[PDB]
Amino acid sequence: QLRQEAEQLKNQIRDARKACADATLSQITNNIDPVGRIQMRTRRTLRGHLAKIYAMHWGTDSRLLVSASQDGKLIIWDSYTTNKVHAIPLRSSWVMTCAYAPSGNYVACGGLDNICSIYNLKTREGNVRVSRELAGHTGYLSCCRFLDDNQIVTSSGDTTCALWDIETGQQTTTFTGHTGDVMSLSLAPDTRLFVSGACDASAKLWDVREGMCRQTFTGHESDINAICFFPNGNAFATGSDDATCRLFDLRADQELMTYSHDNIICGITSVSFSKSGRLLLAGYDDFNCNVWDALKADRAGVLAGHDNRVSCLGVTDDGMAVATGSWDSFLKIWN
Amino acid sequence: QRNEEKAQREANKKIEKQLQKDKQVYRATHRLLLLGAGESGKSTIVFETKFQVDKVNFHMFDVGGQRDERRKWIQCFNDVTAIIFVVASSQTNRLQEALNLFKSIWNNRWLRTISVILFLNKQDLLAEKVLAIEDYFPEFARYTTPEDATPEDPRVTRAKYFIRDEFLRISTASGDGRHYCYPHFTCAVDTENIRRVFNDCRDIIQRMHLRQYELL
């Protein structure tokens, strides 16, 4: 009768969420100043890649950015003068994640080879070389995020996230219980919790130190492709394969707002927030990115310069730019 | 500060002389999926398998590490030139499970330009599996080969040719000329299987160019 009592437990959380549900924020934020139409023009355009670009991560210096494409190249750009600082070749041609270290010294990438590699780029001996590869996953890697210069969390396609250690190559903790390809992850500002969306329409809050699960959010109806995090640490947004972004608050354990329109039939592939958390940038499959307001769902601005898809998107730590990589091998920096 | 910008463009143009050298070796190698298996029916003769026919580099990749669900990693093979779809001809209705995988590759939003090369393997064990199949497909008893010829037995020829026309009903229903299917039969005589992909990938580039020039 373990499944029979689970319906009593699942209906216990459902009616408890109606106890805290008093008014949606669309009725609360009805007395705020709207932002209106914004216009982002393409400032720079980094043209150095030969295949589809699957991930970029902006460095914490707000100057450099790493991008990864599926021809076996990891190019560290310089977003002010469009100069290629480095151009690393990879062992596997199919990569779908990349990450810049918050000290600037390291860079990471993984893909269909089930291996997170680490490349040390601030070396005084020679050129860039692979530091240590992390092979413990039985599925493709989807997202990589550095905690410090010694710890990294990697989500994979074998339903399990994993906190690693760069020294000795061993997994410190592990996170199980998604039942779906974990497609992305994010990180907290204080770096003690992290969320992870997967292919079972369920984002899931975790714990780095304890290695346990805190909460589980279920409001989507298809596979979750991207996730981000609100800058204060109290909420996160989540885009899925059904043209809907939903803002979940992790202190009321339910949704706040749903960002959708009538004439959008594509899916989200990238979600990020601004610096003040007022604009929500979302990349789509019909080649253009929309700029949703976070409080109202007013659909402020549309930026369109791409050709084949929009696969990745990022906002700098000072909020001065937005770079959208795409499947036509061109990064474009918007401002 | 002035010497820092001179050191920046010196490191820039050194990279540009390597990216343009790597571009001409990237556009000279043809990538290939292999969505069958490494079952040595068409695998030991030909993840990275690299061969070379007529001084052309081919890049065949058998993806095996992924577990069951392919709806997220198969869309990273949309810049490929062809998908090789090795499938055994001869329980639990293993043929219809491949008939629905081919129907899903053909109708994807991203693999709707890739042209499948279909290998109908396990051919030498089909003659033993036909003389004892027809209950799984009731239209097999009412079907006859119209005009094709040049195969042993007439019962095993009609049984083999029924499987090939089962795939072409899907391949000729929503193609619109952007991609075709290239069915073949092979069984352990796979010395003439490496050139069979070479002659088929040559026709994929030619029909790609002729349709761009509005000649097909």
């Epitope: 329409a201 596979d223 | 577990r67 069951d68 669900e69 392919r70």
Partner: nanobody, 126 residues
Framework: QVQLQESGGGLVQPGGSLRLSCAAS????????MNWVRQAPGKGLEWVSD????????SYTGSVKGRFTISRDNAKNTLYLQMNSLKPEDTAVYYC?????????????????????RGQGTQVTV
């Protein structure tokens, strides 16, 4: 929270009739293509039939052609499989799967296990 709850089934005589119904809550029913997947004891999962998101296209496994049928009702969100002329080789657990994405022509459907959009399955035996 998505839900695919099936009903019907039971132990009948070989040659009778059955009607399974699948009530779906949590998603818009009108814009997904639905499926019926059975699993025989000892065997893996095996696809049976499907239906498009409006009722136009309807396909079957050839081994169940003529006997079975499949219908939708997009106003009450229920998926039906009317079964006639059963057989001792038809005893299976019948799941009610669906497409992973809306407005989508293809589907990458049922696996070894752990497909995210599926029901518990009602036992059907003869």
């Amino acid at each position: 929270q998505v839900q695919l709850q099936e009903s019907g089934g039971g132990l009948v005589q070989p040659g009778g009739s059955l009607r399974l119904s699948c009530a779906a809550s949590g998603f818009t029913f009108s814009n997904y293509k639905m499926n019926w997947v059975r699993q025989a004891p000892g065997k893996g999962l095996e696809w049976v039939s499907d239906i498009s998101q409006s009722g136009a296209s309807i396909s079957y496994t050839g081994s169940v052609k003529g006997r079975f049928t499949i219908s939708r009702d997009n106003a009450k969100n229920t998926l039906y499989l009317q079964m006639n002329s059963l057989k001792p080789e038809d005893t299976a657990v019948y799941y009610c799967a669906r497409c992973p994405a809306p407005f989508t022509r293809d589907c990458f459907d049922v696996t070894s296990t752990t497909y995210a959009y599926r029901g518990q399955g009602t036992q059907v035996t003869v």
